[PDB]
């Protein structure tokens, strides 16, 4: 019963922009993956054994208290020098990482902050003054931040209920936003206007994750059904289900195949896109799985959060448990892997955020 609705032409020019941004990204990604396949398997498998020898030696260093309230989300910046945490108070602190000194907490929220997400061109291509961060809260609130203001720049007022998560397009011009309207919105930064309000779930949408080539955007929410939208066509490309409980985290892999949706039924599920299957249902944790993040640019492993006190590394593909990053005293609420692959941070309900590294 796919109902269609006319949108504004801002959506159409934004979709043609997303097409002409994503297609060269997808061509370059597929050609670089074809060049990664053509090198001999001795070098590739030795490189993955190199990486697994590093990943089994992921020891905790610099665990630091965030607030008197439990932290809900961390997101590594590009340049991997800052780390934006999101406490359940209004504060959205930014720690200079790996040193974990605080840098200019962001005040301006009232209820429980959900995610704060750095811009994809924040450190590398975005000046400090321009919008750099985007937080979201348990009331109707999404608001952008700079790195030097400590009180936000122009908020987003299209929401009335709890926004669960936020993620940027790999452009940065677009800002996906799961709401609890059983829908997710897609804000735009050039036009400064909400271009898209996609209702495709039966219950509230929790986490959105954009394809790293920029074409797709997976969602997935409390209806236990994850969607995979194309930005260009609307048009939910690969409906995915097999979870029975609330999907709490999506991530797309830097190789364009996989989507690992981690859900409330303690599984994680690695789906293909060139097969439309559920390739492997990782029996991940003892309690529900919130944060699921692949590695950046090479994308060789899969890190799952948990509402038991752990976070686990699974190889990719193969999905064997490389290392349990245990040690927290509370539930691991959100995580992110640094964009060089060298650093891994998980916030928690223990009010701490940590860093795991190779020794």
């Amino acid at each position: 019963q796919t109902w269609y609705h006319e949108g504004p032409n801002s959506l159409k020019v934004a979709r043609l922009w997303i097409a002409n941004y994503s297609l060269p990204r997808a061509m370059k990604r597929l050609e670089e993956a074809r060049l990664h396949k053509e090198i001999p398997e001795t070098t590739r498998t030795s490189q993955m054994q190199e990486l697994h020898k590093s990943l089994r030696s992921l020891n905790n260093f610099c665990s630091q208290i965030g607030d008197d309230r439990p932290i809900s989300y961390c997101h590594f910046s590009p340049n991997s020098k800052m780390l934006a945490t999101a406490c359940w108070s209004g504060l959205c602190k930014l720690w200079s990482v790996p040193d974990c000194n605080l840098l200019h907490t962001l005040r301006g929220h009232n209820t429980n902050v959900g995610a704060i997400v750095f811009h994809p061109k924040s450190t590398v291509s975005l000046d400090p003054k321009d919008v750099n961060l985007a937080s979201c809260a348990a009331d109707g609130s999404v608001k952008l931040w700079s790195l030097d203001s400590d009180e936000p720049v122009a908020d987003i007022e299209g929401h009335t209920v709890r926004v669960a998560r936020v993620m940027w397009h790999p452009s940065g011009r677009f800002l996906g936003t799961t709401c609890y309207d059983r829908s997710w919105r897609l804000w735009d930064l050039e036009a400064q206007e909400e271009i898209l309000h996609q209702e495709g779930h039966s219950m509230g949408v929790y986490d959105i994750a954009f394809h790293q080539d920029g074409s797709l955007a997976g969602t997935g929410g409390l209806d236990a059904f994850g969607r995979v939208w194309d930005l260009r066509t609307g048009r939910c490309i690969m409906f995915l289900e097999g979870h029975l409980k609330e999907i709490y985290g999506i991530n797309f892999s830097p190789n364009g195949y996989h989507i690992a949706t981690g859900s409330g039924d303690n599984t994680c599920k690695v789906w293909d896109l060139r097969q439309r299957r559920c390739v492997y249902t990782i029996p991940a944790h003892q309690n529900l799985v919130t944060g699921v993040k692949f590695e950046p640019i090479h994308g060789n492993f899969l890190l799952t959060g948990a509402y038991d006190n752990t976070a686990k590394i699974w190889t990719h593909p193969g999905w064997s448990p490389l290392k349990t990053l245990a040690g927290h005293e509370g539930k691991v609420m959100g995580l992110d892997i640094s964009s060089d692959g060298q650093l891994i941070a998980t916030c928690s309900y223990d009010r701490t955020f940590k860093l795991w590294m190779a020794e």
Binding site: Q1, H5, P8, T233, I282, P283, S320
Partner: protein
């Protein structure tokens, strides 16, 4: 892969059309409690209408009134109190859960409502070739209405259990505390939930090498429990 299939779909397929696709359903009653004064009032008013309707049935005249309460007189009243205690044992003799009403009520206690999703334990044991403990596992999985498998292998044999949560808690109380194993220990490998139940019933499948055990699991669409338990077993064996 030359171009991934959404890119082949567009290369033009775009215009100002956002859509509302195929909403799918996600895959209530409240009990009434009373304060103790309301229990007293409800009991006393039910009893007052009960005494009123018994005196009503005396007032219609269907029966003479019930039994009101030197060897001869209390021998009479001894026969009448034997009649009274016998009537108490009659009212306990009917309404007794005769021989199988206990069985159906124990069943409706133990057999939960698993659709609404099935809770799955996965255990690994180092060795359960002991007959008594594999009997406890098989019999308590069958009796708690738990489904699953015990595949058998050297140093990691896998017990996938699959039922309602109140049975899952009893099985983990059994498997982790009640079954006293001993170098042989049992751990809880996984405790999650899946959409609906996979296995047939607790059947001790077995192969001494790993690939056929993974094939037997992959018959059920449940190979991930095997790969998880095997990999954490060999990682504990290395560490």
């Amino acid at each position: 892969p030359e171009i991934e299939w959404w890119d082949s779909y567009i290369i033009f397929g775009i215009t100002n059309l956002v859509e509302h696709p195929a909403q799918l359903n996600p895959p209530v009653t409240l009990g009434v409690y009373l304060t103790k004064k309301e229990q007293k009032k409800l009991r006393r008013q039910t009893r007052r209408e009960a005494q009123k309707e018994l005196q009503e049935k005396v007032r219609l005249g269907l029966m003479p009134p019930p039994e009101p309460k030197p060897t001869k007189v209390e021998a009479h009243v001894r026969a009448q109190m034997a009649k009274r205690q016998k009537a108490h044992e009659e009212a306990n003799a009917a309404r007794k859960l005769t021989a199988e009403q206990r069985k159906v009520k124990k069943i409706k206690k133990l057999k939960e409502d698993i659709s609404q999703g099935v809770h799955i334990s996965v255990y690994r044991v180092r060795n359960l070739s002991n007959p008594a403990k594999k009997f406890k596992i098989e019999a308590n999985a069958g009796q708690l209405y738990l489904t699953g498998v015990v595949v058998l292998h050297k140093d990691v044999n896998v017990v996938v259990v699959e039922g309602g949560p109140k049975a899952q808690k009893k099985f983990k109380r059994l498997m982790l505390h009640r079954i006293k194993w001993d170098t042989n220990k049992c751990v809880l490998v996984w405790e999650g939930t899946a959409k609906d139940r996979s296995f047939g019933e607790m059947k001790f499948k077995q192969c001494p090498t790993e690939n056929m055990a993974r094939e037997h699991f992959k018959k059920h669409g449940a190979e991930h429990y095997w790969d998880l338990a095997l990999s954490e077993s060999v990682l504990e064996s290395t560490d």
